[PDB]
Amino acid sequence: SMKLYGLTGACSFVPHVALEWVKLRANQDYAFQAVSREFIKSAEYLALNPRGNVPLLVDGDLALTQNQAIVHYLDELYPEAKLFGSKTARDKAKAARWLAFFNSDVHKSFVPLFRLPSYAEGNETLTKTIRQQSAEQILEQLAFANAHLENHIFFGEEISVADAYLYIMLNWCRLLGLDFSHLSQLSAFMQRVEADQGVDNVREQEGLKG
Amino acid sequence: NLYFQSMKLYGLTGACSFVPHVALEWVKLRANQDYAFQAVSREFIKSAEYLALNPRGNVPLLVDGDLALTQNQAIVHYLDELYPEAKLFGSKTARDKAKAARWLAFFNSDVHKSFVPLFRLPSYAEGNETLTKTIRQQSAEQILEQLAFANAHLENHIFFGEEISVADAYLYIMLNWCRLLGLDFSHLSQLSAFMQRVEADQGVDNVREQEGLKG
Ligand SMILES: N[C@@H](CCC(=O)N[C@@H](CS)C(=O)NCC(=O)O)C(=O)O
Ligand SMILES: N[C@@H](CCC(=O)N[C@@H](CS)C(=O)NCC(=O)O)C(=O)O
Ligand SMILES: [Cl-]
């Protein structure tokens, strides 16, 4: 049985949702191990993942990192679970495109809001500037996602791992006090994602409600 | 013939779009499917005509009929689904493919961004000589720490797939960026040998020719 190491509420939410969909749709249970930021820098965890971060999926002798690799792997093993919102190559790729945008381009913009560059620490003006630029970048990227939702209810034909990724980044925005109320589709999107049983179960497990 | 055109890749020569270019060349060589390559300028990708195809104004972009597909990882996973026989991830087996996909993701999502400040200095450092030097040094250090991790893998593996893969193509082009930037990685001893192995691949060789990367 596979095991996922994750930080609750972090990007590892997405493979956690994927695993729960596999559970609900393909009848395969899995283990979730919530980790602390202290544990992931521990000698024990570093021996499994020298990069000292999450997600990490363990499936027997396979220790697999990277959000996109994990979910593409699960999709290959369990095509019937429709992790990318469809079974057809074209539609899966379109959802994979959104996942990749979120994971490679958007998540990136958040990094300075979670961990300030070393050169900025103690510099009030530079710190403010870096945080401002991150906020502006995020809002510009969210506007692009929001525009898509003007004509589509999800980032797949049905709900997909891309939707889970945007959802969690919007939860980060709420926690950081980065408002997105001007992007008119995002609130309803969050409600639709929250209505999915797999998402609901994971939000419960990771302590994300309320 | 008149109803189905080859796939078309828009790319910047020598940039990250090299990777799906190599993927398409491998599909050509191994699955006998030709494709079109359109080299673009940095000016053309900010043009009105191009923004109509790709509002994000960057590359790669793969057009296959009515599908306009962006993102390196999405493009290569798509081609792998259509042409599994091409072994774009260095294997046909799900676990071996996933391990290669993990390296591709590391390169595309984690390492590539470390280069960003070296290609385009953050605006707030413009005109600030000391901050500019600190940013560039720190970015160079970050890249080398990430490359050291790739180097370690190569201590007991010939490639990042079981056979050569899109992950190898991604590291390769980043090491080409390092050379072009003057970022010395020669203390990581597996990397030069790795570049030679990658360059020996027929598909890589073909794409390097097409993109003008030989010297
Ligand atoms: N490209 C990686 C990025 C993973 C990543 O950024 N992980 C972060 C957030 S989930 C993390 O573990 N941060 C804690 C730390 O690095 O100490 C992936 O997609 O898996
Ligand atoms: N996450 C995107 C990143 C695309 C990207 O970084 N593209 C660069 C090339 S390395 C680009 O288009 N740069 C535009 C320019 O240099 O003007 C992907 O994987 O496709
Ligand atoms: Cl994109």
Looking at the structure of chain B, the number of domains it has is 2
Domain identity same for A104 and A68: no
Domain identity same for A134 and A202: no
Residues of B in contact with A67 (CB under 8 A): 105, 109
Interface-testing mutation among A71, A72, A151, with chain B (most B C-beta atoms within 10 A): A72
Ligand nearest to the CA of B58: 2
Q: Please choose, from the candidates A131, A72, A140, the residue with its C-alpha nearest in 3D space to the C-alpha of residue B108.
A: A72
Q: Residue type at A14? A: V
Domain identity same for A50 and A35: yes
Report the alpha-carbon angle B156-B160-B165, nearest 5. 145
Q: Please choose, from the candidates A116, A142, A143, A115, the residue with its C-alpha nearest in 3D space to the C-alpha of residue A129.
A: A116
End-to-end CA separation in angstroms for chain A:
31
Domain identity same for A75 and A134: no
Size of chain A in residues:
210
**How far is residue A168's CA from residue B32's CA, in Å, rounded to a whole number?**
42
Residue A194 CB–ligand 2 contact under 6 Å: no
Domain identity same for B109 and B185: yes
Domain identity same for B153 and B178: yes
Best of B44, B56, B58 for a ligand 2 pocket test (most atoms within 8 Å of beta carbon):
B58
* Nearest beta carbon to residue A119 from set B56, B106, B134: B134
Q: How far is the CA of B198 from the centre of ligand 1 (A)?
A: 29
Residues of A in contact with B112 (CB under 8 A): 104
**CATH (domain of B36):** 3.40.30.10
- CA distance, residue B167 to nearest chain A CA (Å): 12
Contact (CB<8Å) A72/B101? yes
Q: Which domain holds residue A168?
A: 84-196
**How far is residue B215's CA from residue B212's CA, in Å, rounded to a whole number?**
8
By alpha-carbon position, which residue is closest to atom 15 of ligand 2? B42
Contact A109, A141 (CB under 8 A): yes
Residue A11 CB–ligand 1 contact under 6 Å: yes
**CATH (domain of B133):** 1.20.1050.10
Which residues 6+ apart lie within 8 Å of B34 measured at CB?
A: B6, B28
By alpha-carbon position, which residue is closest to atom 17 of ligand 1? A53
Interface size, chain A vs chain B, as Cβ–Cβ contacts under 8 Å: 99
Domain identity same for A46 and A115: no
Could you say which DSSP state residue A106 is in? I
Beta-carbon count within 10 A of A186 CB = 20
**How far is residue B123's CA from residue B125's CA, in Å, rounded to a whole number?**
5
Beta-carbon count within 10 A of A46 CB = 12
SS3 state of residue A63: strand
Domain identity same for A99 and A21: no
Domain identity same for A182 and A203: no
